Amino acid sequence: QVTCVWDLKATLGEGPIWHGDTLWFVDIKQRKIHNYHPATGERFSFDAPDQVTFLAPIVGATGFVVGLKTGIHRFHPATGFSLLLEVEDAALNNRPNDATVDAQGRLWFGTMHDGEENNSGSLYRMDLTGVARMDRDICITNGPCVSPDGKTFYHTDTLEKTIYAFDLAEDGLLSNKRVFVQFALGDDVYPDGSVVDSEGYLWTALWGGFGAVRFSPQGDAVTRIELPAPNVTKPCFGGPDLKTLYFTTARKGLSDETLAQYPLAGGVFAVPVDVAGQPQHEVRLV
Ligand SMILES: O[C@@H]1[C@@H](O)[C@@H](O)OC[C@H]1O
Ligand SMILES: O[C@@H]1[C@@H](O)[C@H](O)OC[C@H]1O
Ligand SMILES: O[C@@H]1[C@@H](O)[C@H](O)OC[C@H]1O
Ligand SMILES: [Fe+2]
């Protein structure tokens, strides 16, 4: 049985990372940044001026790169949020979503239509050279991640239920886009966030799928973890050995009867696994 380590009941828990030997994540719709210490069970929360969608630590503990609906900001507990750059026109009614940091310190993050209807979202790569638009015309982007060897990049079109794979060159460009995995069975099962473990396997959390799936680098499902929560948003490897798989979940979109049957929905869950994950990388801004 899977254990819920924090009965947070978040509306849209998302973007978990393992940083400073603690778990950091967000509640997008409640505009919260949460921090959880597994060794003591202590929890901390910070209020955000708008929807906050991802966190990525910057080298030197100079804060996090975070995604607010108003743009990409820096967040530091002792200075708040300060605008780093607007990436899209506010008229699009877009907002950032998921993100990851590769082994070279680059921040890959996506945008999406906040109304979840228009194909106005894009994929961006933020590094020392600036911000480059890597893909476009995606309604809900999700789960950017790179393989441990750095040669493969994964990205998710959630509403199309598709996970694509790209060839990633050392210079940082994507090529040879192809469908990695397509979800067919499940009318209300959508792929949300994904990560890649130390062995190159893809862990994908299922929106409306009550858990997460582990895929071989060839695209075959090999393991499924089930949670007492209908909408699982993202996995994150943490713990002292990177073998404790945490999961964020969401109460958004669930009826009152479903939430009464699954009262732990929106909480943070943890499961021990056999394969360790990848260490968290930090964004290079200098
Ligand atoms: O690592 C840092 C963390 O300890 C806290 O201060 O938030 C800012 C981060 O950069
Ligand atoms: O809005 C949600 C988005 O934040 C999440 O990443 O994927 C599921 C969507 O419904
Ligand atoms: O799981 C339930 C929890 O969500 C609620 O808050 O307290 C009662 C528990 O049974
Ligand atoms: Fe997501």
Side-chain angles (χ1 to χ4, degrees), residues 1-103 105-135 137-169 171-240 242-256 258-286:
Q1 188 157 352
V2 173
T3 296
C4 174
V5 296
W6 186 357
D7 186 14
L8 178 66
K9 305 190 197 307
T11 298
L12 185 46
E14 267 283 7
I17 63 168
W18 184 254
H19 175 66
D21 296 309
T22 69
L23 177 75
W24 292 78
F25 60 97
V26 306
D27 191 340
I28 303 186
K29 295 303 181 183
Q30 291 193 25
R31 315 192 179 167
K32 296 262 190 42
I33 297 180
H34 300 297
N35 179 222
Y36 168 78
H37 301 218
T40 66
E42 287 185 347
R43 300 116 58 186
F44 301 85
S45 295
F46 306 88
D47 299 307
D50 219 311
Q51 307 179 59
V52 52
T53 73
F54 70 85
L55 294 151
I58 311 166
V59 182
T62 63
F64 294 87
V65 183
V66 300
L68 283 78
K69 185 170 181 174
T70 45
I72 309 309
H73 295 65
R74 179 207 309 273
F75 161 76
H76 194 288
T79 57
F81 305 70
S82 53
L83 175 69
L84 286 177
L85 70 105
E86 283 191 290
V87 73
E88 288 162 348
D89 184 351
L92 290 174
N93 199 31
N94 267 19
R95 74 155 171 86
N97 203 31
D98 210 1
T100 197
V101 183
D102 61 23
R106 312 193 199 94
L107 171 72
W108 301 75
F109 70 96
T111 54
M112 63 182 252
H113 185 226
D114 202 18
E116 314 168 26
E117 328 191 293
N118 306 343
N119 310 130
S120 47
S122 297
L123 171 71
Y124 297 99
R125 183 203 66 204
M126 188 166 159
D127 57 83
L128 306 170
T129 68
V131 183
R133 193 187 192 182
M134 317 303 294
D135 218 354
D137 308 316
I138 308 166
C139 187
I140 299 187
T141 58
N142 253 317
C145 39
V146 298
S147 59
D149 73 347
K151 309 262 226 213
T152 311
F153 177 83
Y154 302 92
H155 196 239
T156 290
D157 194 331
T158 290
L159 296 189
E160 292 315 287
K161 299 188 188 179
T162 317
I163 303 180
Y164 301 92
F166 303 71
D167 286 359
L168 176 64
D171 73 324
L173 287 55
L174 300 181
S175 73
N176 299 323
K177 179 186 187 185
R178 71 274 193 183
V179 171
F180 180 70
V181 163
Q182 231 178 339
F183 297 76
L185 311 177
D187 287 356
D188 310 330
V189 173
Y190 302 101
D192 199 321
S194 289
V195 289
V196 184
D197 62 18
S198 56
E199 255 171 20
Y201 285 59
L202 189 73
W203 281 92
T204 301
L206 302 176
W207 188 274
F210 294 89
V213 182
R214 195 198 184 212
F215 291 104
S216 70
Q218 297 84 41
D220 301 302
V222 297
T223 305
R224 189 204 288 234
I225 285 169
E226 305 235 272
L227 310 193
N231 301 335
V232 186
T233 51
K234 188 160 191 182
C236 167
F237 286 91
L242 296 191
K243 300 176 125 134
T244 305
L245 197 47
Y246 296 85
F247 294 98
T248 48
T249 57
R251 298 168 82 81
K252 168 213 190 233
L254 299 176
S255 69
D256 274 345
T258 311
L259 284 170
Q261 167 171 30
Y262 300 96
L264 292 185
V268 180
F269 293 83
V271 197
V273 282
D274 215 74
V275 175
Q278 293 184 84
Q280 169 77 40
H281 300 295
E282 312 183 338
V283 179
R284 242 187 105 186
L285 283 190
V286 108

PDB file of all heavy atoms in Angstrom, residues 14 97 142 192-193, ligand 4:
ATOM      1  N   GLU A  14       1.646  20.229  -8.097  1.00  0.00           N
ATOM      2  CA  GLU A  14       2.410  20.057  -9.324  1.00  0.00           C
ATOM      3  C   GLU A  14       3.879  20.370  -9.071  1.00  0.00           C
ATOM      4  O   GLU A  14       4.265  20.832  -7.994  1.00  0.00           O
ATOM      5  CB  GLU A  14       1.859  20.945 -10.447  1.00  0.00           C
ATOM      6  CG  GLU A  14       0.840  20.263 -11.346  1.00  0.00           C
ATOM      7  CD  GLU A  14       1.485  19.327 -12.346  1.00  0.00           C
ATOM      8  OE1 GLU A  14       2.711  19.108 -12.249  1.00  0.00           O
ATOM      9  OE2 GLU A  14       0.769  18.807 -13.227  1.00  0.00           O
ATOM     10  N   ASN A  97       3.714  26.000 -17.240  1.00  0.00           N
ATOM     11  CA  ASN A  97       3.293  24.750 -16.619  1.00  0.00           C
ATOM     12  C   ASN A  97       4.486  24.000 -16.043  1.00  0.00           C
ATOM     13  O   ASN A  97       5.075  24.431 -15.045  1.00  0.00           O
ATOM     14  CB  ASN A  97       2.543  23.868 -17.621  1.00  0.00           C
ATOM     15  CG  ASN A  97       1.627  22.860 -16.940  1.00  0.00           C
ATOM     16  OD1 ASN A  97       1.099  23.116 -15.857  1.00  0.00           O
ATOM     17  ND2 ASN A  97       1.433  21.709 -17.576  1.00  0.00           N
ATOM     18  N   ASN A 142       3.569  19.409 -20.991  1.00  0.00           N
ATOM     19  CA  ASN A 142       3.774  18.681 -19.747  1.00  0.00           C
ATOM     20  C   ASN A 142       5.061  17.877 -19.831  1.00  0.00           C
ATOM     21  O   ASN A 142       5.545  17.546 -20.917  1.00  0.00           O
ATOM     22  CB  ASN A 142       2.589  17.760 -19.429  1.00  0.00           C
ATOM     23  CG  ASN A 142       1.749  18.277 -18.281  1.00  0.00           C
ATOM     24  OD1 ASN A 142       2.279  18.733 -17.267  1.00  0.00           O
ATOM     25  ND2 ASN A 142       0.432  18.227 -18.440  1.00  0.00           N
ATOM     26  N   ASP A 192       0.160  13.353 -17.624  1.00  0.00           N
ATOM     27  CA  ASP A 192       0.525  14.645 -17.059  1.00  0.00           C
ATOM     28  C   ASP A 192       2.041  14.795 -17.060  1.00  0.00           C
ATOM     29  O   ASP A 192       2.662  14.846 -18.126  1.00  0.00           O
ATOM     30  CB  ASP A 192      -0.045  14.799 -15.646  1.00  0.00           C
ATOM     31  CG  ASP A 192      -0.093  16.245 -15.188  1.00  0.00           C
ATOM     32  OD1 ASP A 192       0.855  16.999 -15.486  1.00  0.00           O
ATOM     33  OD2 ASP A 192      -1.082  16.633 -14.530  1.00  0.00           O
ATOM     34  N   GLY A 193       2.645  14.851 -15.875  1.00  0.00           N
ATOM     35  CA  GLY A 193       4.077  15.040 -15.766  1.00  0.00           C
ATOM     36  C   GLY A 193       4.859  13.738 -15.816  1.00  0.00           C
ATOM     37  O   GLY A 193       4.354  12.671 -15.478  1.00  0.00           O
TER      38      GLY A 193
HETATM   39 FE    FE B   4       1.715  18.956 -15.216  1.00  0.00          FE
END
